[PDB]
Amino acid sequence: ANLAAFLVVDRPEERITGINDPRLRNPSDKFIYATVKQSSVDIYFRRQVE
Amino acid sequence: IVTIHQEPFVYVKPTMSDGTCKEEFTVNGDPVKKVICTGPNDTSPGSPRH
Amino acid sequence: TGELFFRSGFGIGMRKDSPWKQNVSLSILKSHENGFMEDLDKTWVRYQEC
Amino acid sequence: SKLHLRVVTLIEHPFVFTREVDDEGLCPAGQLCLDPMTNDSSTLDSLFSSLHSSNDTVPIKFKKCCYGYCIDLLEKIAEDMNFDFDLYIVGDGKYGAWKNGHWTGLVGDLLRGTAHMAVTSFSINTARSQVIDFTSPFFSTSLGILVRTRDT
Amino acid sequence: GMMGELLSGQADMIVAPLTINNERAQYIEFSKPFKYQGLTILVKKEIPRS
């Protein structure tokens, strides 16, 4: 019973999706994501106080 | 003052015939307060709605 | 069941700029923090037969 | 061409956040705020004069960039009410209570004839509502209790 | 009816569960609410499955 339940359970998957994700809403150490500095993205991606 | 009958916020109960009404108490025996209210449409129909 | 939606508040209505436009507000606040509404809510709005 | 006045406030998430200062301190998307750490009116006036002038002198530690909810709505009223504003964190962050015959916190620095407004998480009941005025409510709270979940 | 009576000047206080929306909040003045409320739904004693 335990083996069958464990086999059914295993399904990690779950790639990052979008702009509203639990992984992409708070920091950690396992998700250090970057972007080239002082360039187009980073300037805009700073004004959003939200 | 003017008040609207709508359970369970304000009740309306038949007047005890003598001139006052029932003397009841809470489950804790606390002094259930009450006043004397005259209102239309007690029964029947016309005659100033009784 | 379910959540709540379309919030509102059962105020006490009073005529425009009536002579008691303030004192009722004062008393209702001082009570509304002094554990009164909770007592009345326990004694009238909720029961425990369920 | 508009009025000039102070507003005094607090730090309680998510009403009024804190953001670490710039390279030089312009606040891209924020308001420039100052931490006095002192309940003295003349000191504050001195600091304001030093700040809005052609010769500034202030330790960088005293400057911060304030932003969030309540500041947002204050910005909407300043636009609608056509007046600029400064902003400085309160001395101690202790709300308003009676003690030793005195006041403290927001009211402590307000009834002392220092500031002109107060925007924050800030309750209203009896004692505060008597000594000083209050406006209409703009939020409807309650008291919830918190317990660690997922005992499994 | 009720609100209409309030615009008649024979009685003034209206002490009963009167809502406060903006349209009704033009001709009279209320106090700070003493009760929050909203439209809710019930279904049944939840007891599914076997």
Ligand SMILES: N#Cc1cc2[nH]c(=O)c(=O)[nH]c2cc1[N+](=O)[O-]
């Ligand atoms: N309780 C109550 C109650 C209170 C009300 N109060 C109002 O002001 C109204 O318009 N409708 C209402 C309807 C109800 N109702 O029947 O549920």
